Design a protein around this ligand. Structure first.
Ligand SMILES: [K+]
Ligand SMILES: [K+]
Ligand SMILES: [K+]
Ligand SMILES: [K+]
Ligand SMILES: [K+]
Ligand SMILES: [Mg+2]
Ligand SMILES: [Mg+2]
Ligand SMILES: [Mg+2]
Ligand SMILES: [Mg+2]
Ligand SMILES: [Mg+2]
Ligand SMILES: [Mg+2]
Ligand SMILES: [Mg+2]
Ligand SMILES: [Mg+2]
Ligand SMILES: [Mg+2]
Ligand SMILES: [Mg+2]
Ligand SMILES: [Mg+2]
Ligand SMILES: [Mg+2]
Ligand SMILES: [Mg+2]
Ligand SMILES: [Mg+2]
Ligand SMILES: [Mg+2]
Ligand SMILES: [Mg+2]
Ligand SMILES: [Mg+2]
Ligand SMILES: [Mg+2]
Ligand SMILES: [Mg+2]
Ligand SMILES: [Mg+2]
Ligand SMILES: [Mg+2]
Ligand SMILES: [Mg+2]
Lengths: 142, 114, 50
RNA sequence: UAAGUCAGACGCAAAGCUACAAGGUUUCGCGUCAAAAGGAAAAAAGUCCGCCAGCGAGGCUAAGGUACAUAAA
RNA sequence: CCAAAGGCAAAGCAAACGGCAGCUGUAACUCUAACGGCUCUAAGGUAGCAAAAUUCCAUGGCAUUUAAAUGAUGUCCCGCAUGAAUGGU
RNA sequence: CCUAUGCAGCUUUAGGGCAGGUUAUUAUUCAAUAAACUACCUUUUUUCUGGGACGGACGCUCUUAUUAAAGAAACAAGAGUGAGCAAUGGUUUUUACUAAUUAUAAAAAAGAAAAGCUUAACUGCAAUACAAACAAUUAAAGCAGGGGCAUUGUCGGCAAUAAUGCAUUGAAGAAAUA
RNA sequence: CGUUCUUCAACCAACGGAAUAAAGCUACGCUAGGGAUAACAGGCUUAUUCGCUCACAGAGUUUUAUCGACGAGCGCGGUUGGCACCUCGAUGUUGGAUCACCGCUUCCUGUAGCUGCAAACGGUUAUAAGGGUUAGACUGUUCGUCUGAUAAUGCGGUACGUGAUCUGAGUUCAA
RNA sequence: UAAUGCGAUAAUACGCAUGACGGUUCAUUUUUGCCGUGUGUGGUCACGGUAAAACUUAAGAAUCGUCCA
RNA sequence: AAAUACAUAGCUUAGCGGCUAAAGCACUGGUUUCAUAAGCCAGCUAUCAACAGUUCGAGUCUGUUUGUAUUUA
RNA sequence: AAUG
């Protein structure tokens, strides 16, 4: 009788000259209307995301067969295309997290603090429990 | 399923016409600025060279394709260039272009498509 | 279409859950897949999921 | 504020449903009422001007008015 | 008419609780169908009565009754949806 | 007339029970058990809705009007779906090819078909974002291990937008305790 | 016996799914509430209904005498509808008896034109609301059919006028 | 961009060959209409847009035809 | 106007995805009889309401336009 | 073995 499907927000998220950080989504589209340019990626559903720190750019290209192609680019901070820019981006990522924690305040906790320790698997932290809970380092050999 | 663009400082380009095959090596600093061509060799140069010594049929021949590859190898070696990335387009699938690329790889130049 | 259990032939007890069509492929399906108990790829054989 | 509220209404301007009807009904942009006294149009919730701490027999204006009713050519 | 679904009983019981059809061709002119063909069911409503205390078309058609009849009585009739001990006349 | 944390009485081949009688089986010289028949006890019998009933509907996708950011309702309108594929998945090579889907101006260094080898339709983790009352739902660079095809690129299923279901209870494989 | 990991299944399609399961009647009804919501009356709307104008095609056949249409516009609030604004700590139902006030879209009694108006009997238009608008058979009726007379037996509004004036035949409690 | 382009053995050594006429396909914002937002007794108001839709005269480029006026 | 079924040679009646077809009456020809009926033998009806779709292929499955019942207002 |  009635009914409606859940809405999908297709469209751009940033304009020309806006600053982005790695992992941020720039475009949500149902078809490949826009193609990935430099310093960007594309998901299996045609989601375009940034892969470095920089500013968003838009450009148009005319192909060999007379079709129009549209790209999305991310430009480095000072137009630095050298391979040394990657380490600068890594430092900026660490700094950005510190800025956010300072603004939010101490009472917005960003790590858990339980009365027990989480198990370790394959050298990383795991959220799955072991069959038995034991204190670390409270037993000797044999 | 077009892949994202990747910036490279050194790229190899081919221009295949009715009569000749042209190869260029261009250096770039950024996508927004013009490049600087460091090598510019075509079958026209090879034809003028070989014809004096060894008769060839026409510029678009196997002898000239190998000669062009050899001349490109010397220029890159002198300038200390050992690795280049090939720009893929319609002309890149021409038979004459493919022969030149195969010769370059055997000579010792490392050509990458991606 | 049906759900089946792919059981390791190393007798480690590890298994995978997959989907198969018994009419198109009326034989026991076999594949090479990683076995965490041993740490390498081994041979798996189809079995009833129950 | 770990509070109250989850019955809304109409004017101008658009669209669906109705019959390019309803002081109808469903969404949407602005305003007013709801929770707003005072002035103009006859009485005047939703239109026009304009937001009342108190008193005074001072003055200038808004919308609207300027032969009588009824202040001012 | 005891089939199906139940109940009861001595594997049977309807004056126990309940049910009891449809399509089609045919006689001098016409009409009608005495008479045929087919499908299905446990069985396919027999006699009687019938515009009813039962009738949707409806104030049915005809006769008597009145100057004038949505009335009353008589009569015609497969009767939307009458009917034989929840008895019929 | 409609609306309730509604109430009551009555009915039945709506659910459960056996606590009188009958009946069945078994046992001692007025008894014990019950998917039966009668009697009795107790419990249930949505909402939306141009009033209610009758009819219809309830999950999830695509498209139309409210212009060219997003979003936006009615018992408004026009169409799909509760799957399929052991290859129709992954990856290399060749070229007189550039389609089709429920619907649709996707896509040329891309796809489809043909030929070859394969199981990444993996194990353990994850910065940062889209969306969003919450629950869940969506995209994803990167790190370690074992692999596939290439020979230094890609693979954590399928062009994309639907093919789904919390917790509880039950069951299976393995491992650690007691 | 208990815990963890890898996984799956059933009813949840009323599809955020749980009190394990699970249908009805009330005109014998009862209580708490609402004009937040229906049935009669008022209100808004005017599709429909009705009226007028333009249109003058077509019938009559010289006449737009008379009848009359496709199509368009405007008006009325009396027909069938739509909405849910007033009343559920109550606005008495249909028809009649009795007694009324108003409108004119005039049935009779008037005034003035036209006519396919000789007279008589008529037709049509404009204007006019003082007076009049019958007795009976059938039916609970409004309505409708019929009979004997009559100058003629008009329509509509007024809570579809009128039950603190009457009637209770119908409709609408318990048999 | 003559190290061009096109071709009927279509491969490119050979064939046509860059001019000139003709027909097709692509500036005072050309300046009018129109649309959007704001304000409004329903327009004697303001600004912007049309590389969304109608509308002018050129000049050039890409093919194509051609014993050439 | 809602809701559940059905439109098959001349008439009843199979069939509901592999080609477009079964059975009985009727009709036609022959045989039996002095002749007509019954009885016997061989034949015949492109055998699938109308239009648009799905599918390699539809009387068969999905919609619309017609006709017929059945229930409701 | 119904009929004329
Ligand atoms: K009896
Ligand atoms: K209503
Ligand atoms: K529910
Ligand atoms: K009331
Ligand atoms: K008169
Ligand atoms: Mg649905
Ligand atoms: Mg797993
Ligand atoms: Mg609420
Ligand atoms: Mg609300
Ligand atoms: Mg309203
Ligand atoms: Mg209030
Ligand atoms: Mg003054
Ligand atoms: Mg004065
Ligand atoms: Mg009886
Ligand atoms: Mg008796
Ligand atoms: Mg309800
Ligand atoms: Mg959340
Ligand atoms: Mg690798
Ligand atoms: Mg993939
Ligand atoms: Mg009460
Ligand atoms: Mg109300
Ligand atoms: Mg309302
Ligand atoms: Mg008059
Ligand atoms: Mg009256
Ligand atoms: Mg009255
Ligand atoms: Mg009674
Ligand atoms: Mg005879």
């Amino acid at each position: 009788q009635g009914g409606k499907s859940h809405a999908k927000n297709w469209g751009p998220k940033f304009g020309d000259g806006e600053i982005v950080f790695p992992g941020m989504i720039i475009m949500r589209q149902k078809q490949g209307i826009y193609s990935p340019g430099y310093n960007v990626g594309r998901g299996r559903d045609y989601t375009i995301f940034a892969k470095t720190v920089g500013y968003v750019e838009y450009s148009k290209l005319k192909t060999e067969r007379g079709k129009t192609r549209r790209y999305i680019h991310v430009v480095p901070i000072n137009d630095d295309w050298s391979p040394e820019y990657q380490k600068l981006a890594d430092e900026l990522v660490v700094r950005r997290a510190e800025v956010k924690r300072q603004i939010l305040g101490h009472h917005v906790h960003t790590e858990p603090a339980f009365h027990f320790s989480l198990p370790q698997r394959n050298g990383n932290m795991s959220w799955l429990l072991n069959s038995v809970h034991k204190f670390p380092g409270t037993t000797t050999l044999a | 399923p077009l892949k994202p663009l990747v910036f490279r400082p050194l790229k190899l380009f081919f221009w295949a016409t009715n009569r000749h095959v042209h190869a260029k090596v261009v250096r770039f600093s950024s996508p927004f600025n013009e490049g600087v061509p460091v090598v510019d060799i075509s079958t026209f140069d090879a034809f003028n060279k070989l014809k004096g010594s060894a008769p060839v049929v026409a510029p678009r021949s196997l002898e000239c394709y190998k000669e062009v590859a050899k001349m490109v190898k010397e220029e890159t070696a002198r300038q200390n260039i050992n690795e280049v990335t090939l720009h893929l387009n319609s002309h890149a699938s021409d038979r004459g272009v493919r022969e030149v690329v195969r010769e370059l790889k055997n000579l010792g130049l490392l050509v990458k498509k991606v | 279409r049906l759900l089946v259990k792919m059981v390791s032939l190393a007798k480690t007890g590890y298994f995978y859950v997959t989907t198969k069509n018994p009419r198109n492929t009326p034989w026991k399906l076999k594949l090479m897949k990683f076995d965490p108990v041993v740490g390498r790829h081994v041979l798996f054989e189809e079995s009833k999921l129950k």
